[PDB]
Amino acid sequence: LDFQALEETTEYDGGYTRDSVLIREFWEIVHSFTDEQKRLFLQFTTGTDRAPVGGLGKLKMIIAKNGPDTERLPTSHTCFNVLLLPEYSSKEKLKERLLKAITYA
Amino acid sequence: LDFQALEETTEYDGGYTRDSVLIREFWEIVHSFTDEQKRLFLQFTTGTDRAPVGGLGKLKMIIAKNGPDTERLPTSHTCFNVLLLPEYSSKEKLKERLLKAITYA
Ligand SMILES: [Ca+2]
Ligand SMILES: [Ca+2]
């Protein structure tokens, strides 16, 4: 399990970046995890303890800041979906572009 | 297939909100889709043409603005993952909180 490949593909939200103190602390902790902890981490964040094909660099993972210091635990969503939709200039254009995308792939 | 339930649970990013002109146009188009187009839309955005258990209100879907008007088509990611991580006050605390979350569920 290549957690360097996961670190290199991870995206951030809520104010975090790869340079955030919290994120640098996070990757130090994960790189120091036992193999058992690495498997539990994948189960919690992805819903499985196995890498996908192509290894962990093929995962889509976002780490998002959802509050300041707290006693509350981290949470996850294991099956998020995203539609990337440009701001087309008209309703007519949006319909043609969306129909083309869903119908021809 | 209840697309009103999907509309009610959808989240937005990149500057969109439920009040965005583009988003109001989007939901008019989707509500006017034929059942075939609704199935292709789910396949494109989720990787399957079937509702999950509990119907479409149980989907996690984000619609994110990824540019201005363009000839380029919308894109999707069908299996995104998100770790919601509070900004704990120390590395030690982050380790305890993360280990507790992954080990006890
Ligand atoms: Ca071991
Ligand atoms: Ca039909």
Author numbering:
A (entry chain C), B (entry chain C): 742 to 846
Task: Quote the original article.
We determined a crystal structure of the C‐lobe of E6AP at 1.3 Å resolution. The structure reveals a dimeric arrangement, in which the C‐terminal α‐helix (H14) and adjacent β‐strand (S10) of two symmetry‐related molecules have undergone three‐dimensional domain swapping. Interestingly, the hinge region that mediates the domain swap coincides with the active‐site region (Thr819, Cys820, Phe821, and Asn822) and adopts two conformations. As a consequence, the catalytic cysteine (Cys820) residues of the two subunits are either in immediate proximity or at a sulfur–sulfur distance of 4.7 Å, which we interpret as a mixture of disulfide‐bonded and reduced states. We speculate that these alternative oxidation states originate from radiation‐induced, partial cleavage of an intermolecular disulfide bond formed during the crystallization process. We and others have previously reported that the C‐lobe and the HECT domain of E6AP are monomeric in solution, consistent with cell‐based studies on the full‐length ligase. Either way, we posit that the observed domain swapping specifically occurs in the context of the isolated C‐lobe and is unlikely to happen in the presence of the N‐lobe. As for E6AP, the hinge region in HERC6 comprises the active site, yet the swapped region is slightly offset and the subunits are tilted by ~40° with respect to the E6AP C‐lobe dimer, thus positioning the catalytic cysteine residues of the two subunits at a distance of 11 Å. At the same time, the structural reorganization may indicate inherent conformational strain in the hinge region within the monomeric fold. In line with this notion, the hinge region is the shortest among the loops connecting individual β‐strands of the C‐lobe and may thus resemble a loaded spring that releases conformational tension upon swapping.
